[PDB]
Design a protein around this ligand. Sequence first.
Ligand SMILES: Nc1ncnc2c1ncn2[C@@H]1O[C@H](COP(=O)(O)OP(=O)(O)O)[C@@H](O)[C@H]1O
Ligand SMILES: Nc1ncnc2c1ncn2[C@@H]1O[C@H](COP(=O)(O)OP(=O)(O)O)[C@@H](O)[C@H]1O
Ligand SMILES: [Mg+2]
Ligand SMILES: [Mg+2]
Lengths: 56, 56, 63, 375, 375
Amino acid sequence: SDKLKEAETRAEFAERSVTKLEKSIDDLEDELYAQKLKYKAISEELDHALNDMTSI
Amino acid sequence: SDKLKEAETRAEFAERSVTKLEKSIDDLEDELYAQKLKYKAISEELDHALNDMTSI
Amino acid sequence: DIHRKRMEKDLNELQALIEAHFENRKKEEEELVSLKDRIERRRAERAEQQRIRNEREKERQNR
Amino acid sequence: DEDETTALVCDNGSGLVKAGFAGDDAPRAVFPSIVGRPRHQGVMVGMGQKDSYVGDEAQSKRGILTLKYPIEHGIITNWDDMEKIWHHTFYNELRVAPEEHPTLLTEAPLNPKANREKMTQIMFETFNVPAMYVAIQAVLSLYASGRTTGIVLDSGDGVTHNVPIYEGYALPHAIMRLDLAGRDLTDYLMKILTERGYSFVTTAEREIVRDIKEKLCYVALDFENEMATAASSSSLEKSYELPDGQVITIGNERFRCPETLFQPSFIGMESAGIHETTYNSIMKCDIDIRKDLYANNVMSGGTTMYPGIADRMQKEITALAPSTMKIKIIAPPERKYSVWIGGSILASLSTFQQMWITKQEYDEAGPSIVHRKCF
Amino acid sequence: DEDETTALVCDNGSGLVKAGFAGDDAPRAVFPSIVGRPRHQGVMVGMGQKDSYVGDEAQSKRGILTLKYPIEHGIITNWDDMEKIWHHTFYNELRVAPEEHPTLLTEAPLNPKANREKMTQIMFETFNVPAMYVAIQAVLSLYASGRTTGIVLDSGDGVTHNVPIYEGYALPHAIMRLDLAGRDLTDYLMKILTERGYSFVTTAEREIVRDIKEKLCYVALDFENEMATAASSSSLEKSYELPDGQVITIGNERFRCPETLFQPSFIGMESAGIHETTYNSIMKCDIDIRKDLYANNVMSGGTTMYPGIADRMQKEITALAPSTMKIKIIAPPERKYSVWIGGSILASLSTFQQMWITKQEYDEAGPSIVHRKCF
Ligand SMILES: Nc1ncnc2c1ncn2[C@@H]1O[C@H](COP(=O)(O)OP(=O)(O)O)[C@@H](O)[C@H]1O
Ligand SMILES: Nc1ncnc2c1ncn2[C@@H]1O[C@H](COP(=O)(O)OP(=O)(O)O)[C@@H](O)[C@H]1O
Ligand SMILES: [Mg+2]
Ligand SMILES: [Mg+2]
């Protein structure tokens, strides 16, 4: 019975850790997304600058 | 004993989930940091070009 | 005599300018395609994690 | 290594070492002349525990190392340091053995003759280079410009040299060395930043502030009027993002730092600005060609990447000299490599191997042979 | 208050505040720069319940107060703290009103110009001083010595400054600030005492150990030989009687604490010992007068009450510099008051009131007028 309460304790520990990690993954992936999109926008603009250079 | 075995199985499942999510977070973390290192580089360099506009 | 040789090498570098552009453009396109596939990867991962959390909830009330 | 026995071209500039092969357009291994040494002693094991750190390794390990300069304003501290850094350059960076390739080296203007004799002797004994030639960086920058007439302003990191050369002829009687260089710039900026509230002494912040000089610094068109309008100057004031992330804002200091070379009285030099040193240099020589010197001035060095030297140069010389003839400066982009380019140019022609300094000449006449073999 | 409208003389030294009247030989109100604040909140009544505690009151109430430093190495935390301590000094300690007496103040060397502009502005608005003058403590210590030639080593509690002045003129190009001071001394001694078995963190023990430094500390003539003979050293080992009554015995640490300024590598500074900082400072300036600098070095600060700085100073400089001319240090007893004495000296002569910074000048040109009125 003591081993069973210890098992339930470790199970709850791991489940709370899982929930925290899942939320962290979601937020990190959203942040990485927005960051990459802004970098893509600047890269777009710079590519347009390269095209203008070629036109010269 | 049967209940202890079921609880231990569930706890091990949860813990393996924990470790796998941690590894995924690690990989994402490295990619985001690099993305940003190069974002700040390209932003600074666009600003440098603007400084060129000032020198002109 | 040496100076004309420099005028020429700079010219070599000048046209090389576009050659420097090419690797940057391929790297840009690689970032392009990686982000575009990351789009659907993120969406599918969100759906998968929603299903996983559903299983978490059912196991939660089951105990 | 190339299949051909082409020569090595190495510019040991006062502040940067740029090495590579002859026939190449740019030096392959380019590194600053800083050298890092373990700040403490050894107790740990499993990794590191190496004395000399050079190149980008020391740049990454700046914080843990005492950063020392094996050369400052031409003066040589420890030949062992040059031995190690040349070993690193030849084998770890150039991946070349000096046994099969003669070396063309460039030296700082008016370097000691005793320095040349000792460095050549230690070189020949320690290394096995087949042949040798060493030249002044002034004629190298001239070769990079490819015009035999002009006055070269070599702005290294230890000394600034003004050297006039007319129709490919050196004029040592009108050559001068000024002790103002990057070191002074960093020092002066350090004291001004101290008056701005930020007081650092270590070399990492030295590199940070020289980077700031590379990025943001101005050369003031009019000095006191620009501080007068820089009182507030929200737009004119400029900021930098230090790698730790703090935003450090600087205003008039941007153009008050390089100004000290032009106005040495700020930190107490009897010599006036470097434009006066070019002016006196010009008049020392015959009157007639002086106009050509005015119209053919060249500037060289890593510092030249900064803006503002050209406009200031011409305006002040026109103020000092009569404004009949038009004065124009020439400065090709990325001219800090130009000296090394000229070294390649020296190896380009087939007459250069007529005066290689071979091993047997040094074995016969000792180092003293260079006194007759170079000049 | 004296019937005459004589000026106020206040030395806000980095570590001690010494204030009094002009024409006096010693400052009347002298207190350390520590400031105590209630460690907890108010529930009791009938006495106390006061926020700011300064001076001997805080010294007596050290245990109950969080002890904070309104200034550290020149950096200013909260101007309100200076407001309160100046109120206390002027009214509770000096029993004087600043309305009728101009103030001569001394500031730490190379203090921020923005710091000067803000402190002067808050001062003028908050207080009603008729006139103002602020000077660097270096020339004040020079005045106390009364000799226009020499290099001043100002060892405050936050910074140690080396400043050369030849024939009464400042040499900012050869002036340096080192971040080693009393704070470092206490820290290093704290870690060594931790290795001796006694580990404290709070400020009361900080004051106890600085008192130990005042009383028992040595400056080792030879370092490693003296720890070698200090292995046992029953006679050489020295003890102190802490106010609680326990006897705390210290041996080599007595001369291993100040040595750290001389040997910064103990706790990791790129800069070498302060003697190297005086040496470099000397050579930066023209060669010829350097001998006079060697023979005219002065040291100032409260730390100077310790023994051993003079012998160490001369021996190491003679080791570094040629031993032809004789080097001798001068240091009058109780020189920590000397700066304030020099302030009185400034008020002694009748030309000093030609450049008092009056209220109307500040009202016209704002704080910016000091940029043109002091320097
Ligand atoms: N890309 C750059 N932009 C601006 N300044 C630079 C750059 N690279 C180097 N420098 C400056 O050039 C100095 C080194 O000068 P250097 O070129 O070695 O002189 P020399 O021409 O005599 O070899 C350094 O102190 C550094 O501040
Ligand atoms: N009577 C004394 N004996 C020894 N050391 C002292 C004495 N009085 C003060 N000090 C030391 O002097 C330091 C304060 O230096 P201070 O005189 O304020 O520098 P400054 O000269 O820049 O004002 C304190 O940290 C203290 O340790
Ligand atoms: Mg140069
Ligand atoms: Mg002091």
